Amino acid sequence: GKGIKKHLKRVNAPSHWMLNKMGGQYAPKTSSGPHKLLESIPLVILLRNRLKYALTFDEVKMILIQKIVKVDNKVRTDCTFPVGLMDVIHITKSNEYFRLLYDIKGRFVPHRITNEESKYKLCKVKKILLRKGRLSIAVTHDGRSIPYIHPDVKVNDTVRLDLETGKVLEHLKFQVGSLVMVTAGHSVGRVGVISSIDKNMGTYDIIHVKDSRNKVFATRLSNVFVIGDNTKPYISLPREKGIKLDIIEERRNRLKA
Amino acid sequence: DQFTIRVKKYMSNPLLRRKQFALEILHPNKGSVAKKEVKERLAKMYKLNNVNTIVLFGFKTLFGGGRTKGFGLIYKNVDAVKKFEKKYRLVREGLIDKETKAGRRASKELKNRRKKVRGT
């Protein structure tokens, strides 16, 4: 037959997974989740090759059996949960919160997060639809549908959704003074203010982003993430702080130890 | 015989209620030493009163002797030992014995027992 495929070869493991060539034959194909397979990783990989909590897949299963891992302040049990672009994952046995961030080098990395700021996740809505009786709903990259949004919120804005009540708090728009992340660009991991946009008739629209070192780059409109306005990046960025570090002077920094 | 103990990447895992690290034992001019000796030494190191709560594995002595790289695991109690582990490493440690050793004969007999061809 020609049904939906159910395996991924180890060589065909996605780019940012960073899995060894000889360590077996197959990598897990994430079950249908809230985020795309090409841009999210399973919790098994996340806690194995980064957290290093266990040494075998079955040990990871035994960990997952206890209702200790939590996503968006609620319980999850299936070993194939892609964490997604932005979220919060909580572990109560150690009372530690992790939040998924990127690197200027193009990967996924967990970031230690305190309890107060661990209750806030930022979601970029992807679609705006109208339902029966004039109620407007927003569909997010998070695979989450938020009904009854403000008339203020537009398509590309980002929304301060609370984890527990499942309700909006505030909106953040996309002026030339709004901090935006790049999701899957070849220059992924750069934090900038965006100098301006460039809308093209019936095609992709290219937006220019400016950095803290006056570097200017361009990116497709599809894969941007409103993270905060000119005041500050609202959430805690990783150690690299989202500024991309040039190769030669990066080698200089590495050499100078 | 004397030796030196070195522990790398000592990290405690509350989720398994265990700990992990790499064992580097220096025994110059003396061949590979038994695991019981270093078990006693590490018990005294970490103030451990029982011996059956330690798992050791992957002890490669490397070319030339005088060094040994290995990975060590400690347990909270025998309950955790029997709880968060499979049976083969426990067999190697010396707490339980192995199961039936037919192998693939179990599956061969399962296929042989064609359903509703055997009244029992």
Place this chain on the structure above:
Amino acid sequence: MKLNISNPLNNVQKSIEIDDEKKLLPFMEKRIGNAVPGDSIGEEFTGYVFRITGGNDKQGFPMIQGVLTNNRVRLLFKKGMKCYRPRKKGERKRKSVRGCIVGQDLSALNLTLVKKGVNEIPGLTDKAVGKKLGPKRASKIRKLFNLDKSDDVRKYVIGRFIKPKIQRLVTEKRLLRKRNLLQAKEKRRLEKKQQLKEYKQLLN
């Protein structure tokens, strides 16, 4: 030749061994389900009326009803017919069968009595064996005991000690689940009303 005569009202059956052709002759050219008096089959079986209800032919092939032929004719079998055992969901197989018509081809005949005659058969029309399973559903046991909804029937179950577990009970946990669904529905209505009211508030 081998007649399995069964009494539906006594849940028992008995095997009778006959050989003569003309003895079984009076059952000829009759479809399955016909009304025939089993007189020539035995000295005491006279008077008995039998509804011809099963048989098996010379080489072991079964009988059917719809196929009113006279020989072996292969045909299509479905998932839910009366003489097929599928190996997979929706699997079908063609299997040789013998037609409904009765002839000189049968290894055995399964017959049952519909009207009592005159004589008696040891262990067939005298004794009886019960259901060998007690009723389990609440309505079934309530109907078979005639004690309506006055008291629980859980104390009036047949002993093999060990008792079957009555279904369709009146459990307080069932009541609690019902009240939980009701209250959850009303709470959900409350939350949706709050959301729409605050949406009206934020409209301007």
Place this chain on the structure above:
RNA sequence: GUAGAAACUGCGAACGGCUCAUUAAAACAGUUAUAGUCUACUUGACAUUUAUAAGGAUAACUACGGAAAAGCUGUAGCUAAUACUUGCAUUAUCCUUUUGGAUAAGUAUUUGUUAGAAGGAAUUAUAACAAAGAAGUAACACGUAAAGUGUGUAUCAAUCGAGUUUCUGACCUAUCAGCUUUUGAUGUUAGGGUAUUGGCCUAACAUGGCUAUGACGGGUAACGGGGAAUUAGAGUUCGAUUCCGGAGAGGGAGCCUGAGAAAUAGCUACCACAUCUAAGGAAGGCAGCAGGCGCGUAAAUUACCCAAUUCUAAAGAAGAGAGGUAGUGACAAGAAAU
């Protein structure tokens, strides 16, 4: 309570693994569109026209058998379920204006008539009216905060995808120069059909479409690609082969179930083979992991185990010739005694 074979049911079995005969703008790759569709599991929002708990219908089993035999089967009695099937309020809106009164009651899908947050452009979202009308909204089981979960159900969206589809790209050959068009060739109109669109097909009407920028043909000891061999740089040659995609399971044809198969360790029919056969009749596909015959110069064990990866399910404790290890191994490659 702890457990429980046999059993009905759910789910997978449509994944994987193997091979390359057919394939010469077909596949394949890059790059679109789907404003022309569907979409299992999961996740998130969330619904409309007897109840102190409703009806039968049957397995395993018990009892008589039968044939040689197989994944064979009749009558009698039964009983169950989250299998099958009937079926238990209420929500929204307007006037005086917390609140009194008045009012409306169909989700998809289909047809007819109007208006009309987004996209670039709607016959979009949606609202009103006239109609039809599915499938439901819990009659199912367990136990967490010092109320919860499981199973299952209507829609929307995402997910894991698939199907059509634009554009650009190839081996040799003219001792293949004119092809296609009664049997759809090219297009228009209307319809059937499919999940959507279309000569996909039907009826009518038109006479059209390709071509020395090499069509139509013929060969290919031709699966396509990222790749491999050689490089001063250009190039030429191999590409079955770790992976992506395509096709196939003897070679055509057909078909049920199932979301998803024109599936082959599912079925049906033909031929060619070939097995067992009490001679009446049954069942077959190693181009799956091992091994046998035949072919040829040419190619390894009828080994061990799911311990590693990862899959399936009622998902920790069970299977996995996917796969790992062992065995044979002067295919190649690297280190280094005499």
